[PDB]
Structures are given as structure tokens and as C-alpha cells.
Point group: C2
């Protein structure tokens, strides 16, 4: 059994991690749990999520850290930083999207990986954003155990993550993503199934 | 101020209502709230949602009823039926997707509207599925104040709903949906913005 922790903060983007969460949690070998600084966080959409783990109470080791976006990432919280930074040290697969990446950039966590994000100009004055690898202008990017993406790439984000964690064969993940993006009828066209 | 109630049951589809919920809730004139039979329901993805209203405790009148899919719609719950059926009587805009539509079909709520769903063969023995309007094989369908869709059409589902409720001009909703489906870079292509 493998564990995926979804780090969500208040006012988190509803649409960003839904494809990854369902794909993973439905597996017998994968478990999805949420972690936050608060026991209850609201999505931008108005949903209230009852968080599984409060930072400092989550399992020491898990297999995937998914940092979803939202409007609360300008956080100086030392507990939060330790939590994420520790995940990097343990070298566990990490995927960040939208606001989450702004957090990574500001705390010098993007300095050794190729990446992308919402808008690089927002980081121009981040004293800790000194990348060796330049910012890539694409929906999502993967470099070793780090996948980044802008808030408009839930599907691209999910695709690269499933690849990174060897979720399934490429000619299987491709189908799942096609179904997600184009729908049953277009899928039925290109696959019949 | 207008209210949208999202009816979610246990093991609900994470990906189906995220675009509609965020689009609506961000508006000053719209509020999104969840309603269920239980105070806490899990999404297929592993998220636990703290429901706003338990059926029987939700506001008597609201502006939109969104019934999201999942694996718990084979429900004989009389409270649930009364709740939905009452919404139909008050003629409030209603949108159903995935499993939710199976519920509509079985309780004779699709007999006077054109519609679609996951698979019509599943309703072949429903004694209450006697439509005047035939089942349409498309991602999503709108007929007056009823929008239906299969589980693979979150975006189509959202598009028709925003249209039904006159959320904005078509040449505005079209852009929002393009952004949702194709991403920033493809959007920037076709609009520059």
C-alpha cells in the first residue's frame, strides 16, 4: 500500500487535483489523504473539506506529496515549510500546482529542477528563487521527482504525476487522460472500447 | 444573492462539479452550499466533505440544484426523493450528472425532458422511466430547466448550466470553458488576452 498526501490550504482550487485523487484512491495499492494547517478548509468553489491530518500529525513517511493551489500560499508558517522541505530531503515524489509552486519558488525549492508555474514575473524579487534550470512556458513540467504546473493544467499535471510514480503503462495512462479530457464519445471514437 | 445547492452522496465523483462550483461561488451574487443525507461524505478520490445542509435542514428555496454523481445513487431514501422532487415542482433549474441521472430516471423525473446519462440500458427495467423525449447520445443535454450529462462531461455539463442560468454572455462563458478545457497557452493563442 502506498500513500498520497494532498496538501490543501484554505481557498484551494477545486479543479486541480480531482483527476489524480480519483485515479489513485480507487487503486487497492494507493490511499489518498488530505493534510493542512487547519482541520477544515474551504475550496474556492465553496466546499468544506474535513482534513485527515493536521501538519505535525501526519505520517512521517508517505509515497507522494501533492501540493494543490489556491489563494493561501503566501504563508510564512514554519510548520508548513518544515513539512514540505522534509519531503524534498527524503526525496519523495512531489507534485505542485498553481499557488503551491509560488511557495516552492520563494523557499528556494525550485533552484535545482526544471519547472513551470503560473507566472514567473511574480517571483522576480524572491530572494530564494535562484534556479540553475530556467522557467519553462508549458502547462506542466516534470524533472525527476518534481512535477510543477499552472492552475489551468489539471490533466497535464495528472498525466506527468502518474508517469513519475509508474502508475501504469503509458499506453494506459494515455487512455485515462484521453477519457478525462475528451469524454466518452470522442474516446469511443479513437478506441471503440 | 442566488444560491446553488450541490447534492453529494457518499463516494461522489470529485471531478464533476469543480468547474461549476468555482465559477459560481467566486461571484458576489452567487453562493455555493452542499447538501446530503450525511454530515460528512467521502469523494471517490478520498476527500471528506463537511456538508453544509442535511436534507430536511436546507433552505426551502434556492436558485440551482446540482446533483453530482457517484456510487450511492441506488437510494430509496424518501427524504432524498421529496427534496429533489420538490425542486422539480418549484421548477427551479436543475442539473444532474453521472449517477444522479440514474436517480432521476428511476423516479420518473426524466419522462418530460430530453436528456442523456451514462448508459440508457441500465434503465431498461425502470418501471418509472417512460420518456416522451428519447435518450440523446451526447456528453450533455439541456432541455428547459434540466441539464443532464454523463460522468465524463464536467465541462460540457458546466457550459450548459451557466447558459441555463444566464450566468454571463455566451461569448464569455465560451472563453471560460476554453480556458478550462485547453489551458492558458492554447487560450492565449486563440484570444491573446
Amino acid at each position: 500500500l502506498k500513500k498520497a498526501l494532498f496538501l490543501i490550504l484554505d481557498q484551494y482550487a477545486d479543479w486541480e487535483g480531482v483527476y489524480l485523487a480519483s485515479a489513485l484512491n480507487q487503486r487497492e495499492d494507493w490511499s489518498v489523504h488530505t493534510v493542512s494547517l487547519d482541520p477544515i478548509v474551504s475550496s474556492i468553489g465553496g466546499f468544506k473539506t474535513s482534513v485527515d491530518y493536521i501538519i505535525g500529525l501526519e505520517p512521517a513517511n508517505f509515497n507522494l506529496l501533492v501540493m494543490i493551489g489556491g489563494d493561501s500560499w503566501s504563508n510564512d508558517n514554519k510548520k508548513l515549510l518544515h513539512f514540505v522541505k522534509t519531503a524534498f530531503q527524503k526525496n519523495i515524489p512531489i507534485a505542485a500546482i498553481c499557488g503551491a509552486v509560488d511557495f516552492l519558488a520563494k523557499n528556494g525549492l525550485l533552484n535545482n529542477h526544471s519547472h513551470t508555474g503560473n507566472f514567473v514575473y511574480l517571483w522576480k524579487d524572491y530572494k530564494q528563487y535562484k534556479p540553475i534550470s530556467s522557467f519553462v512556458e508549458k502547462q506542466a513540467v516534470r524533472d525527476k521527482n518534481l512535477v510543477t504546473a499552472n492552475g489551468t493544467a489539471p490533466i497535464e499535471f495528472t498525466n506527468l504525476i502518474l508517469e513519475m510514480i509508474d502508475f501504469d503503462t503509458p499506453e494506459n495512462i494515455e487512455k485515462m487522460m484521453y477519457m478525462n479530457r475528451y469524454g466518452f464519445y470522442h474516446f469511443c471514437d479513437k478506441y471503440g472500447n
